[PDB]
Structures are given as structure tokens and as C-alpha cells.
């Protein structure tokens, strides 16, 4: 936004030019500004005002407070910022303070909510947004999180590690991400791994994990815990006893005993 | 239908942040408490503190949302300890509720009280509060 | 005058009652005066204990033109308006007490749960269901359904195809009468078919044939045709085809969930039981399926579960065990408890008639 004399028009104008930890210095000093204005929180006593000092301006402060947390590596206060910023696009519904930026940052969302693992929040995003068929597709940017999360799911890990490597995204704020999704899926394609090979190739191993660097691949099977032979992994499937609990598993023994107590419930069934 | 502007900002610090996003979320507690009791644990959190001196306004907010969870003992604590918020003569849903609760809460303790001691409503054997 | 006082009460609810569906005047602009009978002058007569003296029709009805958007389309597009209704209807949920007001507490979970069904968070769920949980005598055989279906389908979407299982099949039991066995009964089926394809197929489609509306059937049949015989090219081509179906039932996001299954039930036809199968046949299938994942698919279905296997790629085979004669010593103790579970129940069901 050009600059006139706000704070406002500073973060956006510093933002642009880079300076992001300058940026979240500001964010709480003009978070102190706006709460003297009754208009940070969207209201619905509107008529439909939308004008600059009402929600329009509110928005684009917002926005430009998610892209610095964004920037400074500081993803819960991007949701912060997202959770304040949700409304004022539309619920279910309002058109009338719509933006190409807004795209950007639920793409950003659904991936950062991808990251973490949760395949629930995931969907419950995508319901949320104004219809189900519209946004989905006619959105360039929201396709990228939606066909991660298919092949993700489907095992086609290397189709999606590649769609990241190559992306436009990639450059911009997808970057972010591309190091907490590369662990992600490596940890995924080791133990489809371990189970499949009795034995691989070194060789193999440091490409399916996509490294080319064979001292990474050393420090990986070892973190893994594998044996390697010369020229060889050698994989071991490494059960253990127990992974947290819930008994019909054993806290004192007997699932004889378990049968006995069942037992009880049913022979007290017959007799009266 | 959404809290989580109001709810976003206690995850936030400073006081006057804290303050701004309490009473909008006090109005409208028993409305819109779906999406208010999964961020119970930062409301507990403004409470324990005593430098932060608006815990007794943190709790009157809580309260409502742990009668309706059904934790009644729980809410009845934190619906004293908001003091001068607590008033019985507003007489709503709310208010109704947790008076009834209260009186129920004296009783039991004034059973188990006597049987041990003849003067222990004079006494801050039990809860002053309480006794008010 | 207690009389007098009831009678006016009832004659209200007939009067609101018959003025929706075949009597109306529009349905978006009564909602008003609706909204007024009830907060003042109605919550404020009763003391706590209304069941039948309250009725779901008002909420259902008003509720039901404010989603159907095409008599009415909005009136604010900010969304106040809806967003309000929503607002009064979880503040009346407070207003049923958690010892009386059973049938009516029942009601509001069906209707708020809808609403985020649709288009919302599907764990703001979650409180809902809890409160719920108390002593009832009182929740009618429609609402039940009601109740078993909204829970299943947020179940569905969090992943867990056993417990939307046992609450679906539960469902199209009691209710179903020939008022139930209509509109209702044919989303409880979509769900109740879906459900069974995911966790596993889903049984065959003759029984199906004569229970529901043929209409919906040659769609249904055309879904789980594709997931079954497994082909992927078919099962992309028939949800573009059927992309209006998937729609108006809510279930768009069966596409992003039946993708994954559809590549594992085209490996699982395939019986891999020899001692060693060939690479060669499985990596010539996979090609069509994906372009780059051929051996990444054989390992993740190995560390699935679908196959038991061995793979060396030095050597460039796959080593398996019996596809057939599983099913095997403590299958029978899983089915023994859960078969006399099913037995006490029945006899408890006789014990009180």
C-alpha cells in the first residue's frame, strides 16, 4: 500500500522490500494501535461496509502480519493471524472484500496443516471454504496442497517430493515447508523400505531417500538403526514389545482370564 | 459461526491483548462455547495468574463452559473465585444454574461439619465464599 | 383456566405447523415471527420440562429454507443471518437441561450438527455428542437415525470405518417406516454403502436392488463397480461422470478418500500365492496406475498389510505367502466374543418384554 502516515502502510511497503524481522518488531505496536479501533474483531452489525477504516483495511493489515510470521519461520502465530483473518473473507459466504493473496495463504494453511500429520483438520479446511466444487479446483494454488495429500496417501511419494522440487511455490513461501515434508516422507519411504528388502544396494538407498551424497546416507541408516554390510543394507523389520497401551494386552496376565470375566457375564445371563 | 478471532488472542501476550478479546468472549460464552471449550486450558492459564489480575473475569468465562461439559464442583469454584462478576439476583440460565449448585455443594459439607463441630459457619474451616 | 391456557399453546403449534409445507405464505419470511414466538413469551411460560409442548418442525423447517438457497438465496450476504440462527439454536442447547428436556435436547444436536456437516469443522462434533450422553426414555425412533447418521459421517471423515460401521447399519433399523423410508432413508443408504467400500467392499448389490429408489441404485452401482474390479482409468471416468450425485449427498471428499483403496483392490484380486511371483507381471500392471511409483506402490502395500513379502531388486523378485487358506487360530476368538456379546444383548432385549 503506498505509504500516507500509518503504521499500516510502513510493515506493508517494509514487507515488500524485505525486512521481516523488522516487521515483527512492529506487529505488536500495531497490534496496540488497532485495538484502540473497535473494527480488529468482524462484526455483524454490517450492512455491507467494506470501505478502508472498516473491513477492508483490517484485512490487508492481516495479511501482512500471516506473511512476516511466515517469513520469521513462526507458524503458529501465522495461524494466529489466519484465525482473525478467516471471517472477513467469507464464513459461508460475503464477496464484496475478495483477494488473489487470499489463494496463497489457504494453500499455505492446508499444507502447514499437512506437515503436522493431521488428515482430520485437512478436510475440515476444504468444507469450510465457500463451496466444495469451486474453490477446489478453480484454484492454481489450492491444487497444490489437495494433490500432495492424494499422493501422500496413495504412495506415490516420488510424484509429490518432485511437484515441491519443481514448483513456482517453491520459491515464494512453500519453501518453508519443503524441509519439514522432505523429513516427512524419507521417514515414511525408510519403513515401506525396511519391510519390503531383506536386502538393498547402498546405492539404491541414498537415491529412494533423495540424497546423491553418500556420507548422508551412512549418518541415516545408522539413525535408523540398520546394520549395513559392505555395499548393503541389511533391514531388520525391529519390533519391540509394547507402543502405549489398553489391555485385552496384558497389564497382569490372562486373555484366559478376560474369557473368565466375559464368562461371568454371560453365565449370570442363564441361571434366574 | 466462530470464536476463533476472540480465541486466537489469548494465545498472544500482553494484557491489554488478553483484555480486548475477554469481553467479547463473555457476552456470548453460552453461544458460542462448541469452539471455546477446545481452548479451555490457555482460559485456565489467565486464571492461575495473579500479576494478571483480570483472572477472576478469565474464570467467570470458564465456569460456563464447565457446566455445560458438566463438571458442575469444578465450575462451582471458579464461579466464587470471579467474585464480583458472580451476582445471583441477575437470575439467568447461567446464574440459576450454578446458585442451585452451590447450595447443594454447602449442604453436603454441612452434613459431615456438624457431626464434627457446633460454630464451623462462623469458622473458615469452610470456604468464607461460600458461606457469603 | 389451565384448560384455556394449554389449549392456546397447542392451537399455536398446530397453526405454525400447518403454515409450512402445503400452507405457507414463503417459508423465508415467516422465519421472523417464528424466531419471535419462541424467545419471548413461549421458553418463558415453560418451566422445564416441555418435550412434545416443543416440537422439532419449527427449528427443522426454518432451518431447512435457510440451506436451500433458491427460494431464498440470502437476504444478507454478509451472513448474519444464518450465522444468527445458528447462535440462538447452541444457546437453547444450554436452555434444555442435562435432567430434563430430553427429547428436545436431542432435536438441537440433530439440527447444529448438520450445519457443520456441511460447511464447518466436523470435532466442534465432538462436545456435542458428550452432552448428549445422559438418561433418556424420551428421543423418538426418527431423531435416533438422525442422531446415528451425523456420527457416522463425521466418524467417516476422521478416518474411523468401524464405528461409522456399527452406528450406519444401526440406523436403517427402528426408524424406517414409510415417512422415514422415504428422502431420509436414501442419504442413510449412499453413506451406509460407501462406508462398507472403504474399510473393506461392500456386500453384494442384489439386496440393495428392491430397498431403495432405483434412481439413485444405477449411480451407486456404478461407483462400486470401479472400486471393486480396482481399474483406476474406470474409477476417475465414472466420478466425472456422476460428479452431480456426489454433490447434492455432501460427499465430494469421497474422491480424495476411494483413490487410495481403488490401486490397492486392483493388487489384491491378483493372487500372489506362489513361492516366488515375478516382478515383471506386477511392475506391466502398475505402469497404467502410476508413472514413477512402481516399486514404491509394491512396498507400500507390503508395509500395509495387503501382502506379505519379500522383494530383492538385485535379483528382481517378488517372494510371497498363501493368499488363501488364511484365517487361522484366534479369528475364531475375536468372533467367539464378539458373537456372544451380540447373543446377551438379544437375551437382555427379551428379558425386558
Not at chain 2, 13 to 34: F, H, R
Not at chain 3, 189 to 196: A, D, T, V
Not at chain 3, 278 to 302: F, G, H, P, W
Request: aromatic letters at 10%.
Amino acid at each position: 500500500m503506498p505509504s500516507l502516515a500509518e503504521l499500516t502502510k510502513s510493515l506493508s511497503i517494509a514487507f515488500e522490500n524485505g525486512d521481516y524481522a523488522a516487521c515483527e518488531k512492529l506487529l505488536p505496536p500495531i497490534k496496540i494501535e488497532l485495538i484502540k479501533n473497535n473494527l480488529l474483531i468482524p462484526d455483524l452489525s454490517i450492512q455491507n461496509d467494506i470501505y478502508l477504516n472498516d473491513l477492508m483495511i483490517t484485512k490487508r493489515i492481516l495479511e501482512v502480519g500471516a506473511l512476516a510470521s511466515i517469513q520469521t519461520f513462526n507458524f503458529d502465530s501465522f495461524e494466529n493471524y489466519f484465525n482473525q483473518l478467516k471471517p472477513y473473507y467469507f464464513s459461508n459466504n460475503h464477496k464484496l472484500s475478495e483477494s488473489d493473496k487470499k489463494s496463497k495463504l489457504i494453500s499455505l494453511y492446508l499444507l502447514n496443516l499437512l506437515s503436522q500429520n493431521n488428515t482430520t483438520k485437512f478436510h475440515s479446511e476444504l468444507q469450510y471454504l465457500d463451496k466444495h466444487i469451486k474453490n477446489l479446483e478453480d484454484d492454481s494454488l489450492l491444487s497444490y496442497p489437495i494433490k500432495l495429500d492424494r499422493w501422500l496417501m496413495e504412495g506415490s511419494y516420488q510424484k509429490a517430493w518432485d511437484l515441491l522440487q519443481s514448483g513456482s511455490q517453491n520459491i515464494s513461501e512453500f519453501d518453508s515447508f519443503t524441509d519439514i515434508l522432505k523429513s516427512a516422507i524419507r521417514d515414511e519411504i525408510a519403513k515401506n523400505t525396511e519391510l519390503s528388502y531383506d536386502f538393498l544396494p547402498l546405492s539404491n538407498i541414498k537415491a529412494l531417500l533423495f540424497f546423491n551424497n553418500e556420507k548422508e546416507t551412512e549418518k541415516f541408516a545408522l539413525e535408523r538403526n540398520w546394520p549395513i554390510v559392505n555395499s548393503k543394507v541389511y533391514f531388520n523389520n525391529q519390533s519391540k514389545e509394547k507402543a502405549d497401551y489398553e489391555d485385552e494386552m496384558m497389564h497382569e496376565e490372562d486373555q484366559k482370564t478376560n474369557i473368565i470375566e466375559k464368562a461371568m457375564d454371560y453365565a449370570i445371563s442363564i441361571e434366574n | 459461526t466462530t470464536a476463533a478471532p476472540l480465541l486466537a488472542l489469548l494465545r498472544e501476550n500482553q494484557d491489554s491483548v488478553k483484555t480486548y478479546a475477554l469481553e467479547s468472549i463473555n457476552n456470548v460464552v453460552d453461544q458460542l462455547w462448541s469452539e471455546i471449550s477446545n481452548e479451555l486450558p490457555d482460559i485456565e492459564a489467565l486464571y492461575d495468574d495473579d500479576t494478571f489480575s483480570d483472572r477472576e473475569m478469565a474464570a467467570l468465562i470458564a465456569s460456563k463452559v464447565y457446566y455445560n461439559l458438566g463438571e458442575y464442583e469444578s465450575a462451582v469454584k471458579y464461579a466464587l473465585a470471579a467474585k464480583d462478576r458472580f451476582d445471583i439476583d441477575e437470575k439467568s440460565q447461567f446464574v440459576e444454574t450454578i446458585v442451585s449448585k452451590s447450595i447443594e455443594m454447602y449442604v453436603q459439607e454441612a452434613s459431615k461439619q456438624y457431626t464434627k463441630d457446633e460454630q464451623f459457619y462462623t469458622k473458615d474451616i469452610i470456604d468464607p465464599k461460600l458461606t457469603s | 383456566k389451565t384448560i384455556e391456557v394449554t389449549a392456546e399453546i397447542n392451537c399455536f403449534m398446530h397453526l405454525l405447523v400447518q403454515l409450512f409445507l402445503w400452507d405457507s405464505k414463503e417459508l423465508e419470511q415467516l422465519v421472523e415471527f417464528n424466531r419471535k414466538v419462541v424467545i419471548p413469551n413461549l421458553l418463558c411460560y415453560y418451566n422445564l420440562r416441555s418435550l412434545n409442548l416443543i416440537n422439532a418442525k419449527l427449528w427443522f423447517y426454518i432451518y431447512l429454507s435457510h440451506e436451500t438457497l433458491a427460494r431464498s438465496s440470502e437476504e444478507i450476504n454478509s451472513d448474519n443471518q444464518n450465522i444468527i440462527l445458528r447462535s440462538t439454536m447452541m444457546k437453547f442447547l444450554k436452555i434444555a437441561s442435562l435432567k430434563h428436556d430430553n427429547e428436545t435436547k436431542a432435536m438441537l444436536i440433530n439440527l447444529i450438527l448438520r450445519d457443520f456437516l456441511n460447511n464447518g469443522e466436523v470435532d466442534s462434533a465432538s462436545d456435542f455428542i458428550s452432552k448428549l450422553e445422559y438418561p433418556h426414555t424420551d428421543v423418538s425412533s426418527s431423531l435416533e437415525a438422525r442422531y446415528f447418521f451425523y456420527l457416522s459421517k463425521i466418524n467417516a471423515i476422521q478416518l474411523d470405518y468401524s464405528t461409522a460401521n456399527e452406528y450406519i447399519i444401526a440406523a436403517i433399523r427402528k426408524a424406517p417406516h414409510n415417512s422415514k423410508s422415504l428422502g431420509f432413508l436414501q442419504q442413510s443408504n449412499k453413506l451406509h454403502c460407501c462406508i462398507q467400500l472403504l474399510m473393506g467392499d461392500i456386500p453384494e448389490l442384489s439386496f440393495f436392488h428392491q430397498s431403495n429408489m432405483q434412481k439413485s441404485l444405477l449411480p451407486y452401482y456404478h461407483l462400486t463397480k470401479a472400486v471393486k474390479l480396482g481399474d483406476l482409468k474406470k474409477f476417475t471416468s465414472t466420478i466425472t461422470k456422476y460428479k452431480q450425485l456426489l454433490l447434492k449427498d455432501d460427499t465430494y471428499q469421497l474422491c480424495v478418500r476411494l483413490r487410495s483403496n481403488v490401486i490397492k483392490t486392483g493388487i489384491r484380486i491378483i493372487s500372489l500365492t506362489y513361492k516366488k511371483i515375478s516382478l515383471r507381471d506386477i511392475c506391466l500392471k502398475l505402469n497404467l496406475d502410476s508413472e514413477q511409483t512402481v516399486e514404491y506402490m509394491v512396498s507400500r502395500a507390503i508395509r500395509d498389510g495387503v501382502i506379505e513379502a519379500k522383494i530383492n531388486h538385485e535379483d528382481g523378485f517378488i517372494e510371497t505367502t498363501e493368499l488363501l487358506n488364511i484365517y487361522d487360530s484366534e479369528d475364531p476368538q475375536q468372533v467367539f466374543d464378539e458373537r456372544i456379546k451380540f447373543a446377551n444383548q438379544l437375551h437382555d432385549e427379551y428379558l425386558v418384554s
